[PDB]
Design a protein around this ligand. Structure first.
Ligand SMILES: Nc1nc2c(ncn2[C@@H]2O[C@H](COP(=O)(O)OP(=O)(O)OP(=O)(O)O)[C@@H](O)[C@H]2O)c(=O)[nH]1
Ligand SMILES: [Zn+2]
Lengths: 50, 113, 311
């Protein structure tokens, strides 16, 4: 209830799209990888950016 | 081609004003069209210089609509009379094809300037 | 003797005019093309047979043919004066092809010709007809159009099911290469409508009077009115062209910074959801003379027909 409040107050009338709430306030991320070629382009190493 | 209304149309008669009930007797060469479902006028011509309103009578007589007009345009005509000036109007909301129809017929059947 | 080699250098203008005849002498050329007709006894959108035209392709420095043609056609002398007057009124628009009126004798009499310069081989109506009446048994026009504009190469069609949408979904990427041409054609159409309104000319716009570069011609069915009171009729044009606007994705350039396909994308904030003004700006930019009220939000519509129209 702090990140959600922080992004709610920035809205000009209190309404925000639902698709950007997990994108900016979630704490955990889950990735499903088909094969190794896709793996080495998305989550290579120990830290990645998304 | 894509010709602009070969078979033409017929007629122009009746009235006009500027503030609702200002239409007294007849102040408009209200032009054209008697459609197949009933008389539906297209174009308005005015020997006067400023009108915002008109009242065309039809069928029942009790049903005669106080039409809202639009800002006018002006031109001079090549009539045998000589110097003759009107101020053109169309009934508001008239789509492009209808104005093209009446303008083409007026320009190609009768002479203007 | 003379004639062919004198008509050639008379059609040849004053700019560079490296011309070559399209298998003719002084006679006309016959082709099979698509038109949009309405002349009180016939109507429809079909493929008729053109009859009165002589075409000269243009060369360049290394003597290899290019996509530029000089079409000189023959009609009536009254039509000569009418078209000359309308063109003289409309010649300053940058969206109007360059006309050239001259007179030349084929016999003891003198007949008039009208020559148009630097057109393409196919018009917009040809593309619309090819895409809206698809038949894999014979689609030569579509293949020619695709290969002459660097959308693909001639060996792309050696594949089978190259046209299918479920198999080979790469045909979408192949088709999406004409969107910029379509967008430039739309902009030139808006320019032409503005010029017609300012000059006081009344006429109806069809797809077969515009080539694939956007230029306009054929003012044979227009009339004249007082300046500032012109009115173009653009119903059939937009209505028939509409299904092609999404197949080729013509509005892709509107997601870039300056409507330029070489700059990065626009970065909207994630909290914006209205976009009610961008829709109006797009409508005013690409559909200015479409005369029917447009509601960005379908909650203000009057009935189901208006809902369909605005959706
Ligand atoms: N792009 C292109 N189109 C051509 C060519 N030759 C014929 N056409 C078609 O044939 C027509 C020739 O132009 P016009 O004869 O002036 O136009 P129109 O639509 O037939 O109209 P009308 O002359 O009033 O019958 C064009 O409208 C094209 O659709 C060509 O070499 N290139
Ligand atoms: Zn609506």
């Amino acid at each position: 209830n702090d990140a959600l409040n922080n992004i709610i107050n920035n809205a000009r009338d209190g309404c925000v799209p639902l698709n950007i709430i997990p994108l900016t306030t979630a704490a955990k991320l889950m990735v499903v990888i088909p094969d190794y070629n896709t793996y080495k382009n998305t989550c290579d190493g120990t830290t990645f950016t998304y | 081609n894509n010709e602009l209304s070969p078979v033409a149309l017929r007629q122009m008669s009746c009235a006009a004003g500027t503030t609702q009930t200002a239409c007294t007797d007849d102040n408009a060469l209200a032009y054209y069209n008697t459609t197949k479902g009933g008389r539906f006028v297209l174009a308005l011509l005015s020997d006067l210089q400023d009108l915002k309103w008109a009242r065309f009578p039809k069928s029942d007589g009790t049903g005669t609509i106080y039409t809202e007009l639009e800002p006018p345009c002006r031109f001079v005509t090549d009539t045998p009379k000589g110097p003759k000036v009107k101020y053109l109007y169309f009934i508001k909301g008239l789509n492009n094809l209808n104005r093209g129809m009446v303008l083409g017929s007026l320009a190609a059947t009768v002479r203007l300037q | 003797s003379a004639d062919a080699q004198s008509f050639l250098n008379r059609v040849c203008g004053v700019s560079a005019a490296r011309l070559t005849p399209c298998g003719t002498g002084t006679s006309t050329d016959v082709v099979y093309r698509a038109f949009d007709i309405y002349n009180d006894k016939v109507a429809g959108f079909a493929k008729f047979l053109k009859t009165n035209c002589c075409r000269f392709q243009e060369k360049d420095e290394d003597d290899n043919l290019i996509d530029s043609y000089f079409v000189v056609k023959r009609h009536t002398f009254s039509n000569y004066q009418h078209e000359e007057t309308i063109y003289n009124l409309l010649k300053d628009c940058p969206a109007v092809a360059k006309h050239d009126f001259f007179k030349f004798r084929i016999d003891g009499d003198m007949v008039p010709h009208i020559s148009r310069q630097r057109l393409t081989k196919y018009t917009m109506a040809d593309l619309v007809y090819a895409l809206r009446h698809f038949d894999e048994g014979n689609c030569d026009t579509l293949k020619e159009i695709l290969v002459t504009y660097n959308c693909c190469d001639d060996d792309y069609f050696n594949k089978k099911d190259w046209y299918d949408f479920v198999e080979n979904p790469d045909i979408l990427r192949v088709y999406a290469n004409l969107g910029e041409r379509v967008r430039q054609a739309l902009l030139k159409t808006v320019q032409f409508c503005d010029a017609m309104r300012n000059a006081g000319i009344v006429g109806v716009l069809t797809l077969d009077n515009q080539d694939l570069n956007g230029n306009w011609y054929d003012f044979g069915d227009f009339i004249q009115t007082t300046p500032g009171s012109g009115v173009p009729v653009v119903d059939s044009y937009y209505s028939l062209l509409m299904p092609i606007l999404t197949l080729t994705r013509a509005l892709t350039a509107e997601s870039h910074v300056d409507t330029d396909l070489t700059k990065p994308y626009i970065k909207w904030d994630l909290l914006k959801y209205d976009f009610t003004e961008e829709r109006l700006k797009l409508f005013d930019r690409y559909f200015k003379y479409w005369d029917q009220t447009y509601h960005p939000n379908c909650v203000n519509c009057l009935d189901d027909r208006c809902i369909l129209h605005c959706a």
